[PDB]
Design an enzyme around this catalytic site. Sequence first.
Site, PDB file in Angstrom:
ATOM      1  N   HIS A   1       2.880   9.749  -0.981  1.00 41.42           N
ATOM      2  CA  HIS A   1       3.687   8.528  -0.991  1.00 41.42           C
ATOM      3  C   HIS A   1       3.719   7.947  -2.400  1.00 41.42           C
ATOM      4  O   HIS A   1       2.640   7.631  -2.912  1.00 41.42           O
ATOM      5  CB  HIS A   1       3.102   7.487  -0.023  1.00 41.42           C
ATOM      6  CG  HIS A   1       3.279   7.854   1.415  1.00 41.42           C
ATOM      7  ND1 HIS A   1       2.553   7.339   2.455  1.00 41.42           N
ATOM      8  CD2 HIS A   1       4.171   8.734   1.950  1.00 41.42           C
ATOM      9  CE1 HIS A   1       2.980   7.874   3.588  1.00 41.42           C
ATOM     10  NE2 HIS A   1       3.964   8.733   3.308  1.00 41.42           N
TER      11      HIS A   1
ATOM     12  N   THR B   1      -0.292   1.406   6.698  1.00 35.87           N
ATOM     13  CA  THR B   1      -1.656   0.902   6.852  1.00 35.87           C
ATOM     14  C   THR B   1      -1.607  -0.628   6.934  1.00 35.87           C
ATOM     15  O   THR B   1      -0.616  -1.186   6.406  1.00 35.87           O
ATOM     16  CB  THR B   1      -2.582   1.289   5.682  1.00 35.87           C
ATOM     17  OG1 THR B   1      -2.040   0.754   4.456  1.00 35.87           O
ATOM     18  CG2 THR B   1      -2.669   2.801   5.539  1.00 35.87           C
TER      19      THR B   1
ATOM     20  N   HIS C   1      -9.755   4.443   1.997  1.00 38.95           N
ATOM     21  CA  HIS C   1      -8.940   4.988   3.089  1.00 38.95           C
ATOM     22  C   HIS C   1      -8.084   6.149   2.578  1.00 38.95           C
ATOM     23  O   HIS C   1      -7.549   6.931   3.354  1.00 38.95           O
ATOM     24  CB  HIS C   1      -8.025   4.000   3.776  1.00 38.95           C
ATOM     25  CG  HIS C   1      -7.104   3.171   2.963  1.00 38.95           C
ATOM     26  ND1 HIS C   1      -5.814   3.550   2.656  1.00 38.95           N
ATOM     27  CD2 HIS C   1      -7.279   1.949   2.395  1.00 38.95           C
ATOM     28  CE1 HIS C   1      -5.231   2.612   1.931  1.00 38.95           C
ATOM     29  NE2 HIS C   1      -6.102   1.633   1.756  1.00 38.95           N
TER      30      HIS C   1
HETATM   31  N1  LIG Z   1       1.241   4.432   3.278  1.00 37.72           N
HETATM   32  S1  LIG Z   1       2.081   3.295   2.523  1.00 37.72           S
HETATM   33  O1  LIG Z   1       2.929   2.649   3.479  1.00 37.72           O
HETATM   34  O2  LIG Z   1       2.794   3.834   1.433  1.00 37.72           O
HETATM   35  C1  LIG Z   1       1.017   2.141   1.984  1.00 37.72           C
HETATM   36  N2  LIG Z   1      -0.155   1.836   2.582  1.00 37.72           N
HETATM   37  N3  LIG Z   1      -0.972   1.006   1.762  1.00 37.72           N
HETATM   38  C2  LIG Z   1      -0.381   0.702   0.582  1.00 37.72           C
HETATM   39  N4  LIG Z   1      -0.942  -0.057  -0.391  1.00 37.72           N
HETATM   40  S2  LIG Z   1      -0.263  -0.935  -1.407  1.00 37.72           S
HETATM   41  O3  LIG Z   1       1.173  -0.723  -1.631  1.00 37.72           O
HETATM   42  O4  LIG Z   1      -1.003  -0.868  -2.688  1.00 37.72           O
HETATM   43  C3  LIG Z   1      -0.368  -2.441  -0.842  1.00 37.72           C
HETATM   44  C4  LIG Z   1      -1.501  -3.197  -1.093  1.00 37.72           C
HETATM   45  C5  LIG Z   1      -1.559  -4.504  -0.609  1.00 37.72           C
HETATM   46  C6  LIG Z   1      -0.487  -5.003   0.122  1.00 37.72           C
HETATM   47  C7  LIG Z   1       0.650  -4.242   0.360  1.00 37.72           C
HETATM   48  C8  LIG Z   1       0.713  -2.939  -0.134  1.00 37.72           C
HETATM   49  S3  LIG Z   1       1.167   1.416   0.428  1.00 37.72           S
HETATM   50 ZN   LIG Z   2       0.894   6.120   2.452  1.00 37.24          ZN
END
Ligand SMILES: NS(=O)(=O)c1nnc(NS(=O)(=O)c2ccccc2)s1
Ligand SMILES: [Zn+2]
Length: 257
Positions: free
Chosen positions: A116, A196, A61
């Site tokens: 990010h 996400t 993604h």
């Molecule tokens: N866009 S954002 O809010 O920074 C994120 N979106 N997906 C992310 N992935 S991650 O931090 O590795 C993650 C992966 C699994 C559970 C919770 C968070 S961070």
């Molecule tokens: Zn992000």
Amino acid sequence: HWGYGKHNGPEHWHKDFPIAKGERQSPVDIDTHTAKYDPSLKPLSVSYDQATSLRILNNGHSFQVEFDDSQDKAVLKGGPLDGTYRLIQFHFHWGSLDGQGSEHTVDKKKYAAELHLVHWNTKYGDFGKAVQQPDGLAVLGIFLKVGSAKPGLQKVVDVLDSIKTKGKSADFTNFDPRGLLPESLDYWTYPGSLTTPPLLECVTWIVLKEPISVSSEQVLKFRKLNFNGEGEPEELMVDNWRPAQPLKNRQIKASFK
Ligand SMILES: NS(=O)(=O)c1nnc(NS(=O)(=O)c2ccccc2)s1
Ligand SMILES: [Zn+2]
């Protein structure tokens, strides 16, 4: 599974993740005229001198660069935060056109992309525990606009060719994230969520006022990545951003008058 297309994109996520209709979802539009200056806010403290990057991965993604977070090597403190937050990864969101791609907007203005940097609160011992707490994550958001190249980003751009499709990873050591920071650390902050799935409401957002500039050629290389895995029909990885969500009962605070 979820994604960014017409049949599985952000407007569909709530069917599998009902918190998508939550009270503190991200991203949001930052209205610069109603953000409140808070002179109580501290300056940010970014200490990335000892950062250790490990690898870069296409996760289907976006792409993410991962860091060793086994110790206090690269941490964020200060600002609105209490405690020490360790950097675990950074990733980007970007558009198919230069006029869109960011998740946050400023007075409805969209930037070409958004960086990010994700950090977790070490008082909860591990990342998986941190994401279950309302103050578990802090994400530093940096806008990208198209203009002159950012030298510090080129190491990233040049390795995208080796992680073109979902699930591909490559060794990516000795990357210094300080090369991605704007000159000023002035910021807006608000309590929000992952943007996400699973969309957990565990994030303190810190969005820097000053964008960094990248060249047309650099962001072009982002758009050549693929959402699909190897062997599958090609889907270009573009427009992997979630639209602005309602602010509801939240105030955005600014660190600067
Ligand atoms: N866009 S954002 O809010 O920074 C994120 N979106 N997906 C992310 N992935 S991650 O931090 O590795 C993650 C992966 C699994 C559970 C919770 C968070 S961070
Ligand atoms: Zn992000």
